[model samples]
Target chain A: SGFRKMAFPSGKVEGCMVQVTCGTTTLNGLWLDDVVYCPRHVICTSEDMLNPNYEDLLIRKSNHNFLVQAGNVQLRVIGHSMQNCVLKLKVDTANPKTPKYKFVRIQPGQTFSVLACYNGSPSGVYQCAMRPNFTIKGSFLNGSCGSVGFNIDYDCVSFCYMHHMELPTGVHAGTDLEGNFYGPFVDRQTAQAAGTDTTITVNVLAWLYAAVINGDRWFLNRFTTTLNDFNLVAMKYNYEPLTQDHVDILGPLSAQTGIAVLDMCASLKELLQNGMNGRTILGSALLEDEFTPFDVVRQCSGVTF
Target chain B: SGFRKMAFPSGKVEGCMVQVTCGTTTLNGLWLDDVVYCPRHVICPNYEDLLIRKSNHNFLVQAGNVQLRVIGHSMQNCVLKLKVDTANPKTPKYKFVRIQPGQTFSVLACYNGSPSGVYQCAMRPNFTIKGSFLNGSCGSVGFNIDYDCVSFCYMHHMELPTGVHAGTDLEGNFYGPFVDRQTAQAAGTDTTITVNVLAWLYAAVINGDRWFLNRFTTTLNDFNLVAMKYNYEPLTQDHVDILGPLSAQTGIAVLDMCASLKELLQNGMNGRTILGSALLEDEFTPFDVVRQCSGVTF
Candidate 1:
């Protein structure tokens, strides 16, 4: 059972809206049990109405009708002030039936609304009822119908892939998302930006790459084809050392390239093999001219335009 | 100018108490101020009394009264009670006061043998002018007046001493009127009840003292005069070396007694020395004993 209380001014010209919403879905055969109205503010000229006159108002008549519906509902009333007004709504279910009620002070020109929702199969219904007098003569002013619906779907698939490595992988290796590389040699700006003890090592690797390729005058063209190939492979893998075949090419390239092939090769191999493991590259060296220009050169060389 | 609001059957009754005490001393030449008798408790017939038309019956009138005599010279009605049925000396203070045209309620009844103790001052000429009812006239029937005299004394003194010390002073060391040595000692119970590290320390010190004192076995006759003198001085004040004049007395005293002396000396020194100071006694051996006792005793 549910109960409600409210206050109001004296007169039949005023109307109030009482809205109730189901807080949960209703199970099969679930319905409201009862509703009680208590009026706190009563204004009646007659002495009978002035006293505790709930018996004369017939407040219980509205309780019976709500037992059928278990959904949102409203009770609209046009009347004078009613004292100790209460609305009781009961639920009929497998368990012992329990009632829920709300209390409110209904001013002369205001309306009160309550949202009640429930969950169950086949949904429930709600009823709004009111009492006209103390003689047990009341009516159901409004109600909300209840219904339930279900849906099913088939043929759907979902997939997820994760890579947990410190360095960028796949398309994000030497080239950015825009397909721009950091260049064959580390630029001054890039070296400066990568400010670390290994900045010099990165610069030397880039210079060796350029010298073997003989693309930039800043780089010597004295390395052999074999050494050039090894350098290219190392550059592709972040200045990683090539296999023995790469070391064999470095010997002959030393005669062709004015640059110290052995020193450059040893240093590049050490940096990529052992130095990279411990070297901490800071953000400042990325702005160095060598690293910065190298990045621009690589991007310009790889650009589609 | 103090006012009190009391709830009654009708609504609320508000009144103020004014008092005046006459003496040989006079100041501004004003002898009396206007006396206003507020109907403290207005007695009215209830449904039963009105049904029987018991108009002639009297209700008791009892209320505290305030008299405004010369400035600072007033008397307060120490006790007041009103009755509405019959005259009784032991009637409780009534909430209502009533007076019928032909009915008379007992005015006042002093319980201590004579009315003088209660009403004698009111009867005194110039001492008290009868209270004038502002709402209704006063009459007599079974009316009862219960009141006691209130004496006034407004002379009080309060003093508190506050000071700071660099070292610890036992709880009851300072003396004052409200707080004496005994009271201070009583207050020390709080430190123990606090049930913290200090409680353990106090217990250890006490038990250690007993154990060490028991160890001293030499007869009183064997106490070295010089060493005994140094031992008499509290440990806190003692400057003699353990091997010098102080510890030499240990040769004659029992082992337990020597331990007791050492414990007492340490307490005295600790009481006077600042915390963490180098003056603290060496705790290497005694502390181990204390730890052993703590583990085994409990």
Candidate 2:
């Protein structure tokens, strides 16, 4: 229950109404009077919608109160500035069609405020940007200021999420020519049977021996030595020895001349070390055997004598 | 228990006596007869001192095929090669030297009738090498070739072994500067706030509306009509109107250069849709105070 009052100023009279409600049911309609007016009271109904003038309207229902139900309304406020700023709005659920709100220019200082009577859909999402103003009103004619909204259904786009798989199993070992496997054993018999002149097997053995003597188990010298010795031995038996004629033939030639025997030797050494031996053995052997025979023989015989 | 006879091709006549022993017992004074003109028998005086030659020395002992022990003397045929071949004369170990009794190269190879002595140490471990013939004598030399033992010792040196601790624990991280507590916390706070912005609040109000409007969330135009219109309403006087400077400053040169104003409008819209309006406020604060009269006009 509530109280009611009545008053008069000269020829004008003013009164108040009160009502009560329990739960969802109304108990009374007007305990005092239906309508009242005072000389100071003013009506303000025909103001401009844009920048509305609201200086004369007075409080009418100080003691008289009534419940007013309105339809869905939504309001949003945004800023227009060359500098960056945050635009924020809170929605009142009572209205969905038109939003009512306030906005602040966020620049040097960092603070914000809330506006009243703006409502949005419970599931609605919003986005904002700096673009040419869409509204054609005079204030927004410059196309540099404006903001608008759509239903939440219009905003969401397709999306997806992903998870990473675990690390793989087994040794990757890399690709074809890049991967290689070597021995796991001492290969002692090969070492023993290898002749006194340091065959591949003998050189490998010596290298292993050096590594053991020097206490450097990971020394790659032995492996490198074995590769070199293998190439030399292979070339000596399978390819032709260099001839003095070939050297003489190439000695006075111009710099543009094709590769010489010495160059072949260097190439063969590099190829063998990099595990590419036996590439041109037959060609080299045939050439040397045919054209360079007598020179080779002479050299060999000279050495022997 | 037995009978014995002696024969000599040459003429000689003598009588002899010899003693024999078995273990500790001695049979003393065994006699032999001598005769003249004996074709196969010879006798000598003091038989122990007789120097016998091979042609005249012959012996036969028989007693009706009975087993007999004819005990007179024990003889040994010694050869120089056998003595020289012994690897260790003092110690006489077997592997270093070996002997075979009826070997073909023994000194007593063709001894007829009854055997006298047979023994030889044929093989030894002394190192030897072949040599060419020269001059009057075929020379030979021996060298100690120890290939077998040498290889055995060499093998033991080539075995592989494991290594001990040799690396560091914080190898990568300790190379550069490290953040102090305050800096780390500040970074953590920034990340946390940004994550919250992207996660929850912005998506509901401002962002939800901008998204609904099909306008990008963080645009100057969106900020102007949507945020400033509702928030920065101008104050009115009785007869005169004070259009706030912000209304006229929509395209102002100074506002065009302000980065915070731009970021605020842009992030506000984006954050509203991506996060939510509430989240933007929670993560960031806004400054709205107007400059007082003391503010200088530049």
Candidate 3:
């Protein structure tokens, strides 16, 4: 689809190469230290075309089947690491006929394989974040890492994470897709009634930990710092934190973050947690894994507290 | 005790004069536009020392007795008008205190033979700064030391027997596991509404006197249904005018038929004014709503 001598806009820097491979053709493309490098035809073939640059890769899909990779890690052309990342591609032409696009599936990450029975078929796996190096506690839940989704469908819950502790096991944290955690798990009517973006997930989680799980007043301040520190570290690796605002059924003024936290805390203490035991508590599944501690959980949420 | 050279700070900007008369001494003082004006020893002989300023007066009580007036208005030294405004002075030295309801304080008053221009008499009776603008007698009066106090209205005018009804119009917006005013009223069910005894007492106190009536809630008309639903007798102008000085001793937030005090505190303590009131915005707190309802400028 692309013409011959397609040039990379950024002239050329050291340790930069565009590797193109087809059936019987293998080319180690050159780096001309000039303003623009327009080489031979950037061939588009059915075979894999590897363009691994030490610096940032500049590849525009002007109708070309070019697959990018860095050190055996399948890199999406958009520069996102194929590991623990979700990619959706439009598999058809612009002609709006039938379903034109769908999520591109990949082999389960090492941790995800263990949950294979729970997840059933890989065909149902729409969002697969393949973290082969991911580990929790001593062992991963699904061995290394697992893709989390609602029991019904991907859209059923906004966000979901593997339950780390305080479990007979199998219970996972679920929220409306954007990490808007729900506290009314015991009251499914209220849980489902609450929408997303009405309250911040960080506020819910912080309130839960402070009022129910940890019962520590000091954690309120520390939880905020821990998430900030976690986000600081997480962004460097291009992963997003799970802290976002979602539908809050609490009340009108519950839209305010601090007030929402206080309201939820009070509601849980005076209402929900009234007849609950330690094992069957309100936020029992919301705990730390071996690798991620309570503070680490705050960081994983990526909220500013 | 005063002298003759006690001239006002501002020289004289026309329409300004200090009229003083004691025993048989009647004199009109002069003014000099100089930065510091010192007339004859401004004689202060236990009588009224009228120091009238056309422009802003700069009278400093540098150990001298002085009285100020503009027409019939008697003003205190620290910049404040006499009518509807409150005044407080430290009579015994540097100790400042609030002139609590019903407590009489002192004021340097201006009189025309009798008490023709008494400031407290011109004030609203419910919140009047009561003062007899004369010390013992007005005998040969020009200026006199007046003793004053806050005159409170009657307290027993508006009292009610408590009944039960649930909900407030403002509180229904949030703090609820309860029915709306319309729903509760339509159903005519007693079980749905709970009897709040404290709210009845609170309403009784606010409506008992004109001082609290005007300052804490809207007029008696807005809360008529509140009385009826709570099993109280109808409130009238006569009932409202019965001013109780102790009405505001605890203060109040008036809830109409559709408004609930419980909901006010429950639903984050914020609410809008009545549907047809002058203040049409949502106030941040009950105090703020009541304050604006009281027609307070500040």
Candidate 4:
């Protein structure tokens, strides 16, 4: 029930309406077909539906909640910026200024930082043209202002909803599964086949193996975008927002490309290892026998129980 | 027990064996690994291991006493498909097979193309239709080997591993499709043009990936696409010309096949249990082919 009484000023009525009045009192009829299109309640100087720049940004910002200022911020060093950006991140241990946070090639959506020495002369940065401290995405085309291009993410389309809840009935069910899908009966004539490479199930088994390995790299490599420790996330496009499911799918997947979206961990190898648990045990449940080794359609072919 | 009393023609004894029976004479021993192949028996000529040629372009095979008519052309790379009969789905045996070039093949059980209900034979004609991705007439090409391998490979190809997959042993099924060029404007699954949906599914099934397939299908359904529309083609020599590319890509080629159905009619037509469904007056082809373009067997 998304019902709200959007109060509008009734000081002086303008549109055509029906009413009966007796000097001090009055009766009114129902608001008819044309009851929409309300006027502004306050002086909104903020660029809204009518602003040339905001007209576009607001579509997604309003829907996906992108822009709009919030909380506290260091107004000078970080300067003026959106909520996030695929900003310049840097990490260097040897340098006095850089300790362990800076650098990136690509990322999901993040916001990071860098170090700098104004220059070597009086008003160093002012006396000299700002020596490019950042070499970011080459597509920034607005004038004196720099805006976000896109955001960052894990680069994964994970189907995490697939929690293994069903009871397995294979030869190994009710048994251990640490053997990387090794069936119990593994003989050449159907005993125990040896090792990974020469095994009969090697072809398909290799895929699962490779998937886990790559899954590790998928997270491990991006855990930190660079040898240094920093990442930047894009918070806005300011050109046109991307929202439609297939908004010219290829037409710049989205108007905003550079965005910043994860980070938070301790221990280097530990982070990598955390994502590498090939077969993590999930919530355990009792096995039941209500179905076969087929999909809901009962058409699964090949292999056998 | 699966042991059968296989009769062998009495000839000069060769190779290691467990017995040398006269009438019921039998002997047993630990036979060596050098067991040579045996000769054929006269009483049985069923398709299971039948190796013979019929003069009238027909072969009679049996499944437990029920006769079936088989087209008289040896096929290779044939898929042995089986499903219950549509007419009597409760009690019927259905299957389908096509000839492979210069190869020996064996299939188990049925010939019904569709598994249930009115089988869609539309599969055959669609494979032969013009402008098909296969771009070829259905012919004896890559249709080789036993159904046990290819059929299961297609069935289990990357299907999600859920349910009691381990309790049963089978590679899940991967369906084939035909974008019926003969009837491209069919409708189903919403106000969308249903034939295109089926064509998309057909493409999806055969395509190894569905990313673009997913994108395109969505576009066709709702996305703002660029002047897209439905198109189809019928079987013809133009259709026949497409055979090579189709064969080269998805391995679909028009191949010769045989059939000796279980029953007969006075009209000289054999009563087949379920040779499978071809597009009929009742049903429509939908997104199975489209999703196929997701480019995966899954």
Candidate 5:
């Protein structure tokens, strides 16, 4: 009450109002804030009492409920974003016991929706990220710079998204649920609070998307939750990344925010376009990490190399 | 906070203890007495850097820590107080606790009395444990204690293993489940406890081992006719085929005997124990006066 009273009053009711408004087939509700605010704190009525907070409105009761649906996908993201813009994820049994000390930097800022479905050869965590451009090239920044951030976590099969979902301000995103996905963009600290710890946060954002996924909603659950705890060294990835001392002095580890440990025996350029498409796959990463021998020239750390 | 402050005037302290705790190695910073107070407490601790106890080598490391390094006596009549060397401790180290077992005790960590002592060598091996009992590598000492231990002597040495969960005989021990040990014991046993079929099932669920499940289902499934070869050939028997002390004949009989003894118990007694040798015969005295079941005789 103190923060809200002092933070902004009825003057900012517009801001106080939620971004999502679920009426029947909508994934929105309550106050723009959490359900605690939407119902009890904001306005609890006789009718709305049946099912409280959006928590109930959206529960991940079944597996694959948040699955990636097939078909050409053109998703959108709220523009105005942040630095260290990255993505960290896993697929199926490829569970990353802990978040990686890596980040794939994409561009920030956006206006209208961009069809970012990387509809090419099916890829894993590596190639899907290393790609420089999306279907229609970069319409915003340089390459896929403005391609907004989102996480990719697979559940045994089919690529999936497991993070926050966002909506442009004033745009009809979710049902009274006029709030952005709450998946906090972790920095060097809180990343290890990863895994099951984010279930609730994901559920909140998940419901909003699950609700709108009923076709015609013209949306795909896409938002980023970059788990970057650089200090926390995950043991399984213990095998040193033998990134052939190709062009770097500090080995592959120096790849910094853009650094990623992709297993392979091929050149970076080929691997970028066709992730192990027909290339030799190495274990984790190594010296003879075997990549098609080539003049290693790093490119798209922006656009047209 | 209140008790902690009363216990220690010091500020901000926390090992104060688990495999669960091992989730974070920080150890938090406190003593680990709760981990394994072996005697009265059934389960032993995994990591005990403080108190160490077994036999002539018994020694206390940290204050208030008491660990039992038991041998020989498959400690069924378990308790908290360990053996005390007349020359034991002049002071308390590691941890210490005063306890008495629930008459409703158990098989492994049972305690009929307290056992606490320092490193006393050549301690005899016997069933009746007065203070603390110890036995290890002491061949030259020529030590031995004899009793009707194994006659009623049940050292069910069948290592049908594995954990740090404490339960009384009636608690989860005797009966498959209950409000608690004493309550369960006090509430007493049912006919199922007589043959321990329910516990086999419950342990199958709680114990969660391949043998517990597979052995149980297999032995009982084939009308429980599988010959128990472990007793005669402990070395030859596959660990998978071992389920405490079970035999094919008795196993089959316990199967057909369930409904017959449904509402009964042993003697006036409702519960029988897990004396591996006790189940030598079918002792089902169904409280219900059947007098006859088709072509059956009492």
Candidate 6:
């Protein structure tokens, strides 16, 4: 109900059946709030769509609002610029094409900020940058720019919805080169001994470990950069490339890497304490792989970096 | 309950007693398995101790076993050698000093393998090395040796127990430079509107993410190697190094990095799909900071 009236200017008409459109829905000659709005619409900048010949008629056109799309979450860009700066934020979620916040003008030597959902619920990565150039005259850029780069920051106010899932039954958890079941358990014997009906529940991370152990290359490849990083670290530290066996816990329990993500504190602590040549587990490529550990998809799916 | 009988040689008489020791506990002359045993003991090598003048009696000394220590886990070392090869394993759990497996002689051009717990139970880091030199003739080294290092692999069978917890109440989760509470929610309005009574949960990975957002340096330093790796990756890829704000997801939600670990599959996919300049999120230095994310103090 983002209904709003576009007050007609002097000499302008009120209603000559001018059409107001948002997405695919259109309204004509409606009087509620002086204009009809699409479902889930929010009131933004209200401007006249077209002047009708019937005198004093004004059809208000409202731009799409991202804040409403990203429900409850507010994305804000704050800036301290030495020069005049303009910023824009573009959000792309499931429905509708790219919806963006209008350009916000900032004065030199002043601070300016804008909210993404000035009007409401949407989820997706929000891409924000400055107009004319992505760079801010005084913002910091790696090492290429001196202190000349301005100060610019983004503040995203949102909830990270939590979710969980158990590893489904009958999935090939893991095995060694000899096809002997292992891991999540303490040894080959215990791993093999666990009945096929063993119930193993896991969070999103543990599932990833299972995916790797099961040889899900598609799933594993998302971590190509991460694995490449591991190779770099291994090369730097003089260790072998992280092999499937290194991470394989043998199963029912999946991989140690999975548990590392699950019980990051205790599991990782143990890894550091017992690592070879000192912190060999740090050579692990799984350290920074960005992944979503769940199946129930949501606009704001929690991800690990 | 790993008691076993030791057969004495013909020259040794039965009645005379000898000393048998495992750790600090020593048995003088108790006979159970022909030789006294220690509590929680496993029989490994059955060797004679001293040839005392008390007669031809023999004291059987048993080596410590790692299999029983790790509990339900077995550690085995498998090796392939083009040259004469041999291997030994060391287990150091929180017990009587260092315990080692006796050297098992191996012939050249043959596969020789040994288990950390031939008799078994142990935790801690097990350091396994080959006899003489820590090298196998045909294994691979990081290009240092050209098909000359021997092939060796270690197999540790173990279960990773799963644990969970909810983010404790009043933990000072997160805030932006302006001290505004954001994140774990949809927007600033939603975040601020939610009263202080909201229940939020997180796993180990999420907790680590929160710790970073909370700015725990001691806890954060553990990921120094990981952070260093991120820097390397960021430098190689040509993007601004990950900043605190970059990972900050505001509050009640901690950092995005945490969710990435918890819901790695879904969160990361979105990050890659909508990343600025093709994968700016990948440039994040927080990508590899490996901090433990829980505060139950377990």
Local error of candidate 4 at residue A264 (angstroms)? 15
Q: How close is chain B to the truth by TM-score, in each candidate?
A: 0.15, 0.12, 0.18, 0.16, 0.18, 0.15
lDDT of each: 0.21, 0.18, 0.23, 0.17, 0.18, 0.19
| Cα misplacement distance, residue B296 of candidate 1 (Å) | 22
Lowest lDDT sum, 10 consecutive residues, model 1 chain B, at B2-11
lDDT of 6 by residue, B223-284 (tens): 32343433311111111123232224333332333323233222332323221111212211
Compose the digit string of candidate 2's lDDT tens values, residues B98-184: 211111111110011111111111111111101111111100010111211100000000001121001001111110122111122
Candidate 4 C-alpha lDDT tens digits along B185-217: 321111222232233222322433222212111
lDDT tens readout by residue for model 5, B1-298: 0000000000001111111111111111112222221222222232122223433223231222433332221232332222322222222132121112111111111112111111111101111111111121000010011110111111111110110122222111211122212222222111111232322332222212122122222234332222221111111123223322232313522333322222222121122222111121111112100111111110
Candidate 3's C-alpha runs over 4 A off are A1-92, A95-122, A125-261, A267-277, A281-305, B1-298
| Poorly placed runs, candidate 2 (over 4 Å) | A1-53, A60-105, A108-123, A129-305, B1-298
Candidate with maximal TM-score: 5
**lDDT (Cα, tens digit) per residue for candidate 6, span A208-298:** 4433433332322212234444445444433334434433422333332343432322232232234322111111222222111211111
Per-prediction TM-score, please?
0.12, 0.11, 0.16, 0.15, 0.17, 0.15
Per-residue alpha-carbon lDDT of candidate 3 for residues A46-99, written as tens digits (9 for 90 to 100): 222233231122243322343322223332332211111111222221211111
Tell me the lDDT of model 6 at B263.
Answer: 38
Q: What are the per-residue Cα lDDT tens digits for candidate 5 across A71-118?
A: 122111112111121111111222112222112223111111111111
Worst 10 residues of 3 chain B by lDDT: B1-10
Report the C-alpha lDDT of model 2 over A1-305, residue by residue, as the tens digit: 00000000100000011112212322111111221111010112223222322232223322222221221211121211111111111212222222222111111111111000011001001111111111111100011011111111111211110000011110000000111111121101121111112112221222222222223322222222233454455455433233344345333221222323344334334433453122222112111111111212211111110
Among the numbered candidates, top lDDT falls to 3
lDDT string for model 4 (A1-305, tens) is: 00000111110111111221112222221111211111110011223313333223323322112111111111111111121111111111112211111112321111111100011000000000000111111111101011111111121111100000111111111001111111232111122322221111111111222222212223223342331221111111111112222123212211122111112111122332353332221100111111111111112112211
Candidate 1: what's its TM-score on chain B? 0.15
